[PDB]
Design an enzyme around this catalytic site. Sequence first.
Site, PDB file in Angstrom:
ATOM      1  N   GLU A 186     -12.926 -16.384  11.055  1.00 42.21           N
ATOM      2  CA  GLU A 186     -12.312 -16.090  12.337  1.00 42.21           C
ATOM      3  C   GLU A 186     -10.871 -15.685  12.082  1.00 42.21           C
ATOM      4  OE1 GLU A 186     -13.639 -15.354  15.222  1.00 42.21           O
ATOM      5  OE2 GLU A 186     -11.540 -14.742  15.467  1.00 42.21           O
ATOM      6  N   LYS A 230     -10.759 -13.911   3.310  1.00 40.58           N
ATOM      7  CA  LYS A 230     -10.022 -14.673   4.321  1.00 40.58           C
ATOM      8  C   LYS A 230      -8.927 -15.522   3.682  1.00 40.58           C
ATOM      9  CE  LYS A 230      -9.624 -15.643   8.664  1.00 40.58           C
ATOM     10  NZ  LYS A 230      -8.435 -16.505   8.957  1.00 40.58           N
ATOM     11  N   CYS A 278      -3.620 -23.267   9.766  1.00 39.20           N
ATOM     12  CA  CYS A 278      -4.163 -22.289   8.823  1.00 39.20           C
ATOM     13  C   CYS A 278      -3.340 -22.151   7.548  1.00 39.20           C
ATOM     14  CB  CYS A 278      -4.315 -20.901   9.459  1.00 39.20           C
ATOM     15  SG  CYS A 278      -5.032 -19.695   8.345  1.00 39.20           S
TER      16      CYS A 278
HETATM   17  O1  UDX Z   1       6.841 -13.253  11.886  1.00 41.80           O
HETATM   18  C1  UDX Z   1       6.375 -14.399  11.991  1.00 41.80           C
HETATM   19  C2  UDX Z   1       5.040 -14.608  12.387  1.00 41.80           C
HETATM   20  C3  UDX Z   1       4.571 -15.913  12.498  1.00 41.80           C
HETATM   21  N1  UDX Z   1       5.409 -16.940  12.252  1.00 41.80           N
HETATM   22  C4  UDX Z   1       4.949 -18.341  12.332  1.00 41.80           C
HETATM   23  O2  UDX Z   1       3.784 -18.468  11.502  1.00 41.80           O
HETATM   24  C5  UDX Z   1       2.899 -19.469  12.034  1.00 41.80           C
HETATM   25  C6  UDX Z   1       1.503 -18.878  12.186  1.00 41.80           C
HETATM   26  O3  UDX Z   1       1.544 -17.982  13.298  1.00 41.80           O
HETATM   27  P1  UDX Z   1       0.305 -17.042  13.670  1.00 41.80           P
HETATM   28  O4  UDX Z   1       0.686 -16.096  14.781  1.00 41.80           O
HETATM   29  O5  UDX Z   1      -0.259 -16.327  12.474  1.00 41.80           O
HETATM   30  O6  UDX Z   1      -0.758 -18.045  14.329  1.00 41.80           O
HETATM   31  P2  UDX Z   1      -2.051 -18.750  13.675  1.00 41.80           P
HETATM   32  O7  UDX Z   1      -1.635 -19.831  12.701  1.00 41.80           O
HETATM   33  O8  UDX Z   1      -2.764 -19.313  14.876  1.00 41.80           O
HETATM   34  O9  UDX Z   1      -2.974 -17.617  13.003  1.00 41.80           O
HETATM   35  C7  UDX Z   1      -3.000 -17.407  11.595  1.00 41.80           C
HETATM   36  O10 UDX Z   1      -3.953 -18.289  10.967  1.00 41.80           O
HETATM   37  C8  UDX Z   1      -5.285 -18.141  11.474  1.00 41.80           C
HETATM   38  C9  UDX Z   1      -5.715 -16.702  11.161  1.00 41.80           C
HETATM   39  O11 UDX Z   1      -7.064 -16.446  11.559  1.00 41.80           O
HETATM   40  C10 UDX Z   1      -4.783 -15.692  11.833  1.00 41.80           C
HETATM   41  O12 UDX Z   1      -5.226 -14.397  11.432  1.00 41.80           O
HETATM   42  C11 UDX Z   1      -3.350 -15.945  11.353  1.00 41.80           C
HETATM   43  O13 UDX Z   1      -2.387 -15.106  12.032  1.00 41.80           O
HETATM   44  C12 UDX Z   1       3.498 -19.918  13.354  1.00 41.80           C
HETATM   45  O14 UDX Z   1       4.207 -21.160  13.107  1.00 41.80           O
HETATM   46  C13 UDX Z   1       4.457 -18.778  13.701  1.00 41.80           C
HETATM   47  O15 UDX Z   1       5.518 -19.177  14.570  1.00 41.80           O
HETATM   48  C14 UDX Z   1       6.739 -16.691  11.869  1.00 41.80           C
HETATM   49  O16 UDX Z   1       7.509 -17.652  11.622  1.00 41.80           O
HETATM   50  N2  UDX Z   1       7.186 -15.426  11.761  1.00 41.80           N
END
Ligand code: UDX
EC number: 1.1.1.22
Lengths: 459, 165, 457
Positions: free
Chosen positions: A162, A221, A277
């Site tokens: 996913e 993944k 994740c």
């Molecule tokens: O530019 C960024 C992007 C994200 N982040 C941080 O990184 C963390 C992860 O953010 P994401 O938007 O990726 O959210 P998620 O953890 O839910 O999803 C992530 O893991 C699950 C996978 O299936 C997704 O494809 C992946 O994006 C958050 O704490 C977010 O605030 C940053 O600090 N800077």
Amino acid sequence: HMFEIKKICCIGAGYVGGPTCSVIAHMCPEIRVTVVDVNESRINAWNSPTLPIYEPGLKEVVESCRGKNLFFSTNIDDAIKEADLVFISVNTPTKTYGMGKGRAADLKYIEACARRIVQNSNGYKIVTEKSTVPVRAAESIRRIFDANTKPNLNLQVLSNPEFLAEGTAIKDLKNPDRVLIGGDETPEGQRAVQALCAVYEHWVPREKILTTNTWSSELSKLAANAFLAQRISSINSISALCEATGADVEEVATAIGMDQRIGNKFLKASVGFGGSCFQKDVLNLVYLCEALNLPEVARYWQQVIDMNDYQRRRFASRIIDSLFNTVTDKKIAILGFAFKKDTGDTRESSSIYISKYLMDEGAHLHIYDPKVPREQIVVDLSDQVSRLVTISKDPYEACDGAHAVVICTEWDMFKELDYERIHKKMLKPAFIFDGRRVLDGLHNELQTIGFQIETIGKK
Amino acid sequence: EGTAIKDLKNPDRVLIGGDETPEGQRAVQALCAVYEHWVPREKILTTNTWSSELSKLAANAFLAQRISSINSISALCEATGADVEEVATAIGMDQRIGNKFLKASVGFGGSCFQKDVLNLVYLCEALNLPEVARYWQQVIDMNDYQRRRFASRIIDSLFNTVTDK
Amino acid sequence: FEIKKICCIGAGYVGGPTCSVIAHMCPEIRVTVVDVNESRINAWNSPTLPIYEPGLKEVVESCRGKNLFFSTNIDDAIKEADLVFISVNTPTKTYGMGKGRAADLKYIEACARRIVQNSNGYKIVTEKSTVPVRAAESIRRIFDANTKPNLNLQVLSNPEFLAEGTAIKDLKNPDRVLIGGDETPEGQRAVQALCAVYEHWVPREKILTTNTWSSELSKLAANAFLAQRISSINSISALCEATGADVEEVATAIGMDQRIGNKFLKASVGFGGSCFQKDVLNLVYLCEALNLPEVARYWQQVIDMNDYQRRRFASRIIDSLFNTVTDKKIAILGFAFKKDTGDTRESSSIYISKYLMDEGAHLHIYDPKVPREQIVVDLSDQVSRLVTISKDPYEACDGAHAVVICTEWDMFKELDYERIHKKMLKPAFIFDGRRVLDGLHNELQTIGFQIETIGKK
Ligand SMILES: O=c1ccn([C@@H]2O[C@H](COP(=O)(O)OP(=O)(O)O[C@H]3OC[C@@H](O)[C@H](O)[C@H]3O)[C@@H](O)[C@H]2O)c(=O)[nH]1
Ligand SMILES: O=c1ccn([C@@H]2O[C@H](COP(=O)(O)OP(=O)(O)O[C@H]3OC[C@@H](O)[C@H](O)[C@H]3O)[C@@H](O)[C@H]2O)c(=O)[nH]1
Ligand SMILES: O=c1ccn([C@@H]2O[C@H](COP(=O)(O)OP(=O)(O)O[C@H]3OC[C@@H](O)[C@H](O)[C@H]3O)[C@@H](O)[C@H]2O)c(=O)[nH]1
Ligand SMILES: O=c1ccn([C@@H]2O[C@H](COP(=O)(O)OP(=O)(O)O[C@H]3OC[C@@H](O)[C@H](O)[C@H]3O)[C@@H](O)[C@H]2O)c(=O)[nH]1
Ligand SMILES: O=c1ccn([C@@H]2O[C@H](COP(=O)(O)OP(=O)(O)O[C@H]3OC[C@@H](O)[C@H](O)[C@H]3O)[C@@H](O)[C@H]2O)c(=O)[nH]1
């Protein structure tokens, strides 16, 4: 010879299983989708007007389908027995003891689901593991199925990782960049793969559906998640270099991201990434590489976590230094506890780590988040919590009499607060530590009001 | 190199740093006017000289890192029966990652990438940023490992004697 | 299938004696030993064999020209052979990966290519060495990639267990014969053909059959167990010196346990020979390559202890001679790595001589069988100034400050130590690195010698 999926069972009604199956039901009105879970209060919430997770647009998707072809139930056994396709979307917590303690995923719930499926199945079924971090998941399911045969029982195992991100789950599920399905390179495996493809083709163009074998699916993944986490750690490493040399990481990020070979996404420096994740994914990748006698690859990916840990520590010590290295009995407002905006999920949130660093200095924390439940914050921070932690009902209460305001989550409401009112009631010097760059462009107004503004990647 | 003319004629962006003074901005604008003969104004970024140089040092390092990252996955593919070209396809279809610079290889070369990361690491050590220094050093260590692993696969396939072959 | 013509590529300490005994025991088989070294081949065909092995001259002369032949015509011997032995040297790599540790397979591979080039029809190809290191696999690799119509080469492993100095006795009455071949119909047919050769003189119950890798691994391990017994008793010898015990008495008490056995417990200046050190080096290297570092460092101790034993003996000599050997004459009795051979490969005498030369000693070296040129080569300008090679042991001891016995030649026990003492400088020291003078200690002390020996204070 082929197989048509008409009934789907999903074991696991969490951030993955709930939204994914709701979108499947929404997009495939002729398929009956039953989401099941051991957690009764979670199932009751899915059947209520107040869903157990906060995802924009999810309530509307659920309410358009629930009771027609979408069902939430604690009757796991009957859902499996009648299913053509069984998703396994459960949690794999990190081991807390033994080999790989603190690093390796614990497959015990996956294995228990596999055993439960054999017990409750006859005839032919497709069993698909769907998670954000699959760690030898398809293999462990096959091992159980290979060892527990029955006459006429014929179970196929697929991998279907996913890719959704929490907070944008519905948009991500309705328009995925790609769908990834792994299955065996046998006639049986290809028939199962095609069946799952046919489900997704109700709304995903065929050119966006990738098919491979189960291990290549899981490795893809694991690697893709790590590439994403690495972008964040890379720009965070640059944010420290910017702070030391007078540059602004947001301007540097813009210049970097205009290279179309790099792309302009996931270059937003922050207090550090959180979520169930990324850290789990890199830890498991490192552990896997160590087990395969690839220590150079293991120490390469380990830097992604080491940099994230350093980014958090550096942010906390800036706060403590700005308060002249004593914070005993000082009130500090924590704005944002979720690991990112538009979710109530706190798993591995940087807000947890920053709060604990400040609690170790004796700070009196007042924590506000628009969606994280109060009781979750108490659990995440656990006598020290009783002495030092207050959960505020609104951000003005958290900031009243505070020495510092620490923004840890990029909720859009924080840029619209009445900061003149906040300044009046803070002790001076009054600090704002913007760990998300959400207050950019307010810097002149905030300085005029009288705040000391500190943000990541700028000095 | 190898695509210099096409790159110079249609750059993704032009980056110009100058002082944030009247004279500095007059100079920046004069150089902008040259590039505007063939580069749209929205693709020209202006900043100060240090931010310009730091942006280049970092951008080069991000590119080198994509290669070392996919090369690290190539070693994992060899050990587990997967194919790095297929894994790279699956990775690169994420539009947040992008599909460029994911071609695994014996290792990156050129007068830019290694020199750039080495100087970035050295700058970080001089600024007392050892965590940042060792973070970027892995880009070089992985590239060196990729080359060494390739050579030793050759030598192993020749049964560890190559004298006079 | 009956083997009627045998070709052996490699006329060395392994190939020469083994084929000579095969010829002796199998009169109906034509055995041709071949080698690129023409002067070595000429010596095998002469009254003075190129190696010294008790009883070998008698074996060769009963067969040579009847069914045993030595030739430089490698190509025609292969072409006609039913069975081709490969018994060549695999020297340690001198550069690249595994430098100083891993065996160089270049000669095995060259033989394999040469066999393909000169073969048609059916042949069995058998690698025979004391230290086989992936030898069968590299031969198969060559054969598998270079097929011809009706060419059918079978690859066997047949490690050689003989010890030099007892080669003829060991070959005629081996504790066991080990043959490895593929677990296929063709492999088992080839194994059985080779078994049929050995059954001319070896009881079938002493012939072990397995696959090629198990065969090579068994030899690698067996060699290392033997070397380990020596290093183990040598380590106890150092403890005996430090505490007033006698290693020969301790070894006797140890060896009476039938679960330990009483063989290979003779403490010494250190083991030598082309087998043991090479074997442990390759075992350690293989283990490192297989990601078995614990096993690698376990076996490495066999070599580290052997190196320590040599260093300890040498510094004991210097300590006993008043902390200085500059301009002192020292007789070295024994240069071969063990008695009853002229072979010096990895002999402890080489290392002891070099340690003393680096301290400025003037060496007079005597060995009844090692050639003079070999000693010069082994010790190589420093040789010109410090090393003399004597024709007899009394000349080596004439005017010497000390006598160092490094090889357990039986003739050393019987020397005229009355005569030796007269013309030595006084105090006259004997350093017995082999325990060969045990029981003469009283007579030697009465004569006036200071005797120092391994494993006793
Ligand atoms: O530019 C960024 C992007 C994200 N982040 C941080 O990184 C963390 C992860 O953010 P994401 O938007 O990726 O959210 P998620 O953890 O839910 O999803 C992530 O893991 C699950 C996978 O299936 C997704 O494809 C992946 O994006 C958050 O704490 C977010 O605030 C940053 O600090 N800077
Ligand atoms: O045996 C089990 C185990 C777990 N479950 C249920 O499975 C559900 C999992 O939901 P969660 O909200 O905890 O987890 P997610 O849906 O967010 O999964 C995601 O994060 C957890 C990680 O281990 C996974 O890699 C990721 O996909 C829970 O509601 C739990 O009660 C079962 O029904 N049976
Ligand atoms: O996917 C890839 C891409 C590139 N490479 C290798 O990486 C090395 C660098 O190749 P590039 O195409 O980046 O060529 P260059 O080194 O000339 O340009 C690079 O440095 C100078 C900067 O101005 C450019 O923007 C940057 O691309 C080459 O050895 C190339 O073969 C890969 O191994 N895999
Ligand atoms: O390609 C070659 C290589 C070598 N040879 C000959 O093979 C003969 C080997 O005889 P050696 O006395 O050197 O060696 P050995 O018979 O004692 O072998 C032993 O010691 C060396 C180790 O590498 C072996 O494992 C061991 O069996 C030499 O006479 C050499 O000239 C060839 O005829 N062709
Ligand atoms: O008790 C002992 C026995 C032997 N040694 C020494 O150990 C060294 C090796 O002696 P060996 O009698 O084993 O003679 P080799 O090296 O020729 O044979 C050895 O390697 C080849 C294998 O095929 C043989 O089975 C193995 O014995 C010699 O230097 C010998 O003097 C001891 O120091 N003490």
